């Protein structure tokens, strides 16, 4: 991959470009995702339900185009060619929003003023939805291939600093751009995300000589499908396909097929992990609005509570906790780090159950009204800083489980399908988000009504969020027991 001379400098300019093209591809994803519903409910007039459904369709495309944005990378174009293609759409879609916001050109694109603009928003969102679902499956294996020459020790040290750079785009975008959008303007606010992705396309292209790339091999999939047809239409059942067993196929080819049959059961065991992890991202923010916020205030800053620890725990975990666990033989595998990470998610949901339970006690005595993001909430008279204990326990769960889920998906996939297997990883995380979104509605049915009284921008004091968190912990203690069963069988047969 790299010549002997100058190797050290050739993998610091190949990991500086990949890590500086994920900080800028991410600072332009929270620029559009963060203050979207607020933007649409402006003087010029979507409703509460309509505005959100554009932010739920936009995310749906992001998860559902990863596996198909990976198959395209390992069959036709390759990881480098397809990332440049994706960032072209990502930029092309991102140019609709500045035009829509600007009163000068808003009429031309949206159309005649209603003396709305649904056509330009969806064409803008779909293209951005395609760009972020295909860049997100091809930069993660492409980044870690630069340093793979130095063994698994160097691959792990990459995903530590590839996840500290994605979380440095949340703090930079949810903090900087969000403030500019609400207060300064929306033409300026939505123009920085379009410029940021412009630089990412150029920095990635300019560093074309540092990267080490491999030509696509389309015959990997064509053979793989045939193996399935032969086995299903005719010891694991894939053994027959080998020549040694009388089948008409090679030996190593059948090995790749048997590698996908074993990886898949592990991914299906993480759907309960994502479900009880995207619900704590959403329900926590609802709880914070109902606590005494210290004495406008963008509603985005309430979301970066946990992306300011992952910014200060990874440097600590990458220089003080990793080496200590290395010299001692204590936790080498990657499916043993995930099972540890799924334990702090259990204690985090349970921790927030006690905080909420006492909070409902206070409101019955007295409440203090406050306004956040132009609406009013009946917050309790308890400081928001009581919510630190439930966010630290999530700072330790996005270090053992988010950074070890990527490492396992990459290091346990055939070398001919390393983008279609990170693509699936990010598609089974979508199945996780939408399973939970259905779980919230179920528990909010008239029969149970633990959150029936809740509505858009609605008070939750009448609701009972206390019981909901305990349910998240219960469904997270069950999966932890299950994931140990499947994890043990995977390593045993490995």
């Amino acid at each position: 991959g790299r010549a002997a001379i100058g190797a050290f400098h050739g993998r610091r300019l190949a990991c500086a470009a990949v890590l500086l093209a994920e900080l800028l591809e991410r600072v332009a994803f929270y620029g559009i995702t963060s203050n979207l519903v607020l933007f649409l409910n402006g003087p010029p007039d979507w409703e509460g339900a309509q505005a959100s459904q554009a932010l739920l369709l936009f995310m749906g495309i992001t998860y559902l185009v990863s596996p198909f944005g990976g198959w395209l990378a390992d069959a036709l174009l390759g990881k480098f060619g397809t990332i440049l293609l994706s960032m072209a759409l990502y930029l092309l879609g991102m140019l609709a929003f500045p035009v829509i916001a600007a009163p000068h050109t808003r009429q031309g694109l949206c159309g005649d003023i209603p003396l709305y603009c649904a056509a330009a928003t969806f064409v803008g969102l779909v293209l951005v939805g395609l760009g972020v679902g295909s860049v997100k499956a091809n930069i993660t294996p492409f980044g870690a291939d630069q340093v793979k020459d130095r063994g698994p020790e160097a691959t792990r040290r990459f995903f530590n600093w590839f996840y500290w750079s994605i979380n440095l785009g949340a703090i930079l975008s949810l903090g900087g751009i969000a403030y500019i959008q609400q207060n300064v303007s929306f033409v300026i606010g939505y123009s920085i995300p379009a410029i940021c992705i412009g630089i990412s396309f150029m920095v990635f292209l300019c560093g074309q000589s540092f990267f080490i790339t491999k030509p696509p091999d389309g015959s990997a999939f064509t053979d793989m499908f045939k193996i399935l047809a032969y086995s299903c239409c005719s010891q694991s059942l894939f053994e027959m396909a080998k020549l040694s067993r009388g089948g008409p196929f090679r030996e190593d080819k059948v090995e790749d097929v048997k590698a996908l049959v074993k990886i898949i059961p592990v991914f299906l065991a993480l759907i309960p992990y994502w479900t009880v992890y995207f619900q704590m991202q959403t329900t926590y923010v609802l709880q914070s609005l109902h606590l005494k916020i210290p004495e406008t205030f963008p509603a985005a800053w309430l979301t970066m509570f946990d992306a300011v620890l992952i910014l200060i725990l990874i440097p600590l975990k990458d220089k003080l906790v990793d080496p200590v666990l290395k010299r001692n033989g204590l936790l080498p595998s990657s499916l043993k780090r995930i099972a540890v990470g799924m334990f702090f998610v259990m204690c985090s949901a349970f921790a927030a159950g006690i905080l909420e339970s006492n909070r409902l006690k206070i409101v019955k005595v007295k409440t203090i009204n406050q306004t956040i993001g132009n609406v009013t909430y009946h917050a309790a008279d308890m400081p928001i800083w009581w919510q630190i204990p439930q966010y630290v326990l999530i700072g330790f769960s996005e270090i053992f489980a988010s950074i070890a889920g990527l490492e396992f998906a990459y290091s346990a996939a055939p070398k001919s399908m390393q983008s279609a297997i990170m693509g699936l990883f990010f598609f089974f995380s979508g199945i996780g988000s939408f399973v939970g979104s259905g779980l919230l509605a179920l528990v909010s049915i008239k029969e149970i009504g633990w959150m029936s009284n809740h509505t858009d921008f609605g008070n939750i004091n009448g609701c009972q969020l206390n019981y909901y968190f305990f349910l998240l912990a219960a469904i997270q203690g069950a999966t932890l027991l299950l994931f140990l069963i499947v994890s043990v069988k995977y390593d045993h047969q490995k």
Partner: nanobody
Amino acid sequence: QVQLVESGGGSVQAGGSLRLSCAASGDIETIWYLGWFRQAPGKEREGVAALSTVTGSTYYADSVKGRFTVSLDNAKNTVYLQMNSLKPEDTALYYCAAAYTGWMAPLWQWVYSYWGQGTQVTVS
């Protein structure tokens, strides 16, 4: 890159039988399906039967079921199309083709890539 050699063409009367064979010269691998297409003069092309080189399943056209048989011979690498109970309506030109993908459609002509010269068969 792949070329098919036809053979066995001929003409017979009503009630006769024939054994058509179309050989191949391209890569034995990289080929998933083989099919036979019958097209009368000045008439739209139509498919007769298809055969898969990995499973062996045969998809005989609904209009010619029960009167034509197709088999594969790996050793000879040349498929055969046995025919019986020939009728004048079968009088037409015949083509053999291969493809790199057939899990979509085994008979639709808009899938096969490589084609052959074809052979004319007349039934009187």
